[PDB]
């Protein structure tokens, strides 16, 4: 029961600002991921243990980036692409979003093994990056797109088409939002925060130049991940809470939190642009490889 809260959208905030951010992200991400893929593929020396992880992440980021023009077009006027693409777009978006966050957890495990256990851990890293990546990144991501195939389809009203996941009752929405947060933030967050913290606990007291240089980069990575992915999930959580009626603060509160989610999801989309800078172009070895591949 109770009254009904209907969404309200600003013309400018939905028509002029979001398309510009989407376009900027599209261009920057496609350029960065393209450069990383060409550098990784055109090198001839070998494929180091961490040169096999940059490629997975670049592929996932490229798949995510390809989705952006469709969302920009939808936000501008409406959906023109039919019913099949209203499923294909969601499938691609979900796969890329989940894989691009699980790959970070695997990279963190690789680094923790390669630093803390340096003398003896030469076999497990190879086993991980050659066999377990497919089991632990791509298989769950693919298996989590069944709801996209099932519950996503375009619907017609007047002369405007909307592409959205249509669910029968509120509970499906809450179940899938809780699954989304649990798989996208909690599972990789604890792994990253538990490995990098015990790395910087060991790289701190040394007076060498290289260790002091690597400490800053690790701290930058830890802060960047959470500062990019936290506000969106806070908004998702406080929306799922009000869908359960455990938060009752009127309707203007709901409109405000929806505006916050809409404005911060675009901010969270910058992961596909911040990943190549943080994981590829901040390394001396990769810089040398890129300079070699230029010629």
């Amino acid at each position, epitope marked *: 029961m109770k*009254e009904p*809260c209907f969404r309200e959208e600003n013309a400018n905030f939905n028509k002029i600002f979001l398309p510009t951010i989407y376009s900027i992200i599209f261009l920057t991400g496609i350029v960065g991921n393209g450069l990383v893929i060409l550098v990784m593929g055109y090198q001839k020396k070998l494929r180091s243990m961490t040169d096999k992880y940059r490629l997975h992440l670049s592929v996932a980021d490229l798949l995510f980036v390809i989705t952006l023009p469709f969302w920009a077009v939808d936000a501008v006027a409406n959906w023109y692409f039919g019913n099949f693409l209203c499923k294909a777009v969601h499938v691609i978006y979900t796969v890329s979003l989940y894989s691009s966050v699980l790959i970070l957890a695997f990279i963190s495990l690789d680094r923790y093994l390669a630093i803390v256990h340096a003398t003896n851990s030469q076999r497990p890293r190879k086993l991980l990056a050659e066999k377990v990546v497919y089991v632990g990144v791509w298989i769950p991501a693919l298996l989590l797109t069944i709801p996209d195939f099932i519950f996503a389809n375009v619907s017609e009203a007047d002369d405007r088409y*909307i592409c959205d996941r249509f669910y029968p009752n509120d509970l499906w929405v809450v179940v899938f939002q809780f699954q989304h947060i649990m798989v996208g933030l909690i599972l990789p967050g604890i792994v990253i925060l538990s490995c990098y913290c015990i790395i910087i606990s060991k790289l701190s007291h040394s007076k060498g130049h290289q260790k002091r240089k690597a400490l800053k980069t690790t701290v930058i990575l830890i802060l960047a991940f959470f500062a990019c992915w936290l506000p969106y999930y806070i908004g998702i959580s406080i929306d799922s809470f009000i869908l359960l009626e455990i938060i009752k603060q009127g309707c203007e509160f709901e409109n405000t939190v929806h505006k916050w989610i809409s404005i911060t999801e675009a901010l969270a989309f910058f992961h596909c642009c911040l990943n190549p800078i943080l994981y590829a172009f901040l390394g001396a070895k990769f810089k040398t490889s890129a300079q070699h591949a230029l010629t």
Partner: antibody
Amino acid sequence: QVQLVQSGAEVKKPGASVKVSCKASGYTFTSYGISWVRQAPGQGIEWMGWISTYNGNRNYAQKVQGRVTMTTDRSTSTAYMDLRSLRSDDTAVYYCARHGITGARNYYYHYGMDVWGQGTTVTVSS
Amino acid sequence: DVVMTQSPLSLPVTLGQPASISCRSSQSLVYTDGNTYLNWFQQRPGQSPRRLIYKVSNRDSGVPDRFSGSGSGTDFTLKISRVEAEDVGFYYCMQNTHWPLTFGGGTKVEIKR
């Protein structure tokens, strides 16, 4: 096809209660809402409510507030409209029309009343 | 809410001559995103109201091109180019931008003789 079918004509006594049904078909039921509209004989059309057919968020007209209740049956794909404490003024013809759009994230009410079921006649006399 | 009045209350017509029904709203029928959700209905006697045009100008499929709409702001109308025997019945205009929605008074289109 996208059509809406309603109940039959019925005669009642003052102070009684009535219920009419609007069985929809031909379209995905759980993506739109149903609005109930009446038209008194020789007087303008007027609105008395809305219902969601998805998490049941109903709203009622100010005048008919507290005298009418609406429920939907998602399993059988139909909507009801319960009215009680009838006067002689209630003699009219009640209509049923699809109204609004719903979804996980998109949820509006500015989408027009298109299907417009055939409507039933209701009379009250002693 | 928003009260809409439309005139004339009655309007006799001779065949082949235009007819004009006009309704103007109490407030400005513009939403935050723009557009103007006002639509016109025709109710031939012994039937249910049937949509003719929506959003002030667009016409839904299956309606004869004779009906046309124009105008904007808080003053606009509906006009029929050519009238035959199948244009007799009440006409209403409804706005759906504010909560709730409201219906016009209704104009009977009689046939002149």
